[PDB]
Predict the 3D structure of the following.
Amino acid sequence: SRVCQVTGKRPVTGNNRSHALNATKRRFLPNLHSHRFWVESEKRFVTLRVSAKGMRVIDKKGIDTVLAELRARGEKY
Amino acid sequence: AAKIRRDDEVIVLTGKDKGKRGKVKNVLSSGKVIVEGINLVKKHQKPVPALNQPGGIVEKEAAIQVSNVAIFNAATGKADRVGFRFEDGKKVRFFKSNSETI
Amino acid sequence: HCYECSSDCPNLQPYFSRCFSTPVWISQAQGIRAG
Amino acid sequence: MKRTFQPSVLKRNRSHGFRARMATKNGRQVLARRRAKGRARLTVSK
Amino acid sequence: RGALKSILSELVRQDRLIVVEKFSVEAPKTKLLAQKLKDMALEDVLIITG
RNA sequence: UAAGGUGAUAUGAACCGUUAUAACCGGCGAUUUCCGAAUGGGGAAACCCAGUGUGUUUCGACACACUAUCAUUAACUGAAUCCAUAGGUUAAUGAGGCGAACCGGGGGAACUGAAACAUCUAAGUACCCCGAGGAAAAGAAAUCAACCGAGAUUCCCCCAGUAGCGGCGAGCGAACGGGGAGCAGCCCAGAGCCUGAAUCAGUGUGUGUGUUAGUGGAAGCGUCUGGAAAGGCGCGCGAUACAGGGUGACAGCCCCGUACACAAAAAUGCACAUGCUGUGAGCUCGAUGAGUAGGGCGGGACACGUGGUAUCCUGUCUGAAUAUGGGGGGACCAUCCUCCAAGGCUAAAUACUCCUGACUGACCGAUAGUGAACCAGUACCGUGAGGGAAAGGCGAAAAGAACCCCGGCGAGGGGAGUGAAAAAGAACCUGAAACCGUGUACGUACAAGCAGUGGGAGCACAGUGUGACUGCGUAC
């Protein structure tokens, strides 16, 4: 399902509002891509369907620090 | 704790035999009590080919209510009520009005 | 001697009231010309 | 002529049978609604 | 309060208020109180104590 | 705890027990087929087919046990590939399923209202899903207030149908402040001295107290009617008990109870006392939660529909300061008040009732009250989801009609009998009306129509019934 593996961004729902304010239901899907991140600890590549907000969490916090927050959470990678 | 038991010479307080004295034959389940020679009815007993093929108008005794009898005291001469005391670790039926054990 | 049976109605109409009333499917009366 | 009900136990038990009802979420809700009603026969089965 | 003041005013009119100074009974026994109002000449009564 | 029992329709039959295990009631224990999460694989539930152990074997076999998947962890051995992973196996743990409502979260209508309708409404409702607990959630100020101050959340009453929002329409609708219910605050981002230092848990004896069987209970007789007395009349007695029920009619005193006084092998709820184990105090200091706050865009939530509009949430794109700093105070700014976000836990007041116990009712009384007073979610109906009835009363007690007649060894009936009553006979209390008969009185076979009404003979009864002829007269 369209969930970021680092930030946990679900698709959220909301409205389309026209210029005549007609509300109709839509979904704000997260900007998800599967990307392979190089870890020098594990000496491998690891792929993660991550949002583009999550790609910024990874290089700001570290890729070891992000994965440590996934094994201690319950995600599988 | 029954106040009216298997073989007690009782007296009837109510209902067409008011005053008559007989002995209990068997206490049934539903508060009905057979008294000997007291509550006589007239059963038109149908003869079946076996099993008491005498099929007369059999006169048996019907069940009377257990509250309509009282135990005959006979040491006062009157009907009398029952209480329950403990003598010698046994629950003891005793008469009212003279407190003495049955 | 197991007598005084009832009047078992049809198992079609669940409102025994109209069980013997109308079939309750199609009402075909066809000759109506009003213009 | 040919009426709508042509019985077959195999087509019955594969459509409305207990294992067919217990296969999906919406059939276990059927069986939940028929225990909650108090139904004698739960499915078409026996 | 205007009703109760008007009922108590009427109970002294139809002489159904009797004020005692003490109404007490020694043993907590219904037999004694059953006697309590025979001398008082009461059968249907409401006792109101403080 | 007992003198009676072997559940009910349900009689028997064969028995068991009688003051010490007959049954009954309770606590604990054993047994607990098959299906169903169903778990050894399968399957059209209630069936089919095994695997591997372990026995035992008359050699035909027979038993008992194991064998699900997933999650976490550990052990071993293990590719492409050398390390190493992935994988594979074997263990231990734990999970799943069902459940009426309440609860939190994720999704989310339309009819309707607007007198049409699209913004708005209905309504974040119905529903669907996920998850939890006895409650849940929220919760210890980035809060309000207004220059005074308040001091976590929740709930209730006001504030107030106010301020506002709003095709400024329909409608929506607060806070501040005040009165109450209940009221506890604490941790981690951290190292020292001290060093079980109270805590808060679990487990176990111990006490106090319920729950789960129970025990004792207090007293009335004559008399008349009657089928029968509980009624009437007479005269007593109990009452911390005159709540209720039953008994042949209406019982304080007949029974069961009730008030009251009591009781527990054993297993449990609650407190307390705690011993023993786990967490872990107090003091010195530092530390003070970043892809966050904020912003641009799009939405949503706030009573608040983007409007001048704060605040919150965040899909997307960005991006601080780091206490000498930061948030808020309804656009925004300056003052100066107040607070310290980006970690978490937290009882009570609150909501609910599938279920158990009592208790109550200006609640129902069999077309009512549950759909269901009764073998009712049944009979029936539908492929199915699903729908879904009707049906209570003999009598005080079966004493439920022996026997005799007619009949077809019928059905039904007439006697006889029971009983107060059979016009209580089971198609059974009471038995209305429609509707259908029989008997009797009167009328009626030359008379036209809302059928009555006014007049009215005659006749039949003991005033009633009928009503010839006649005037007027087209139901609701």
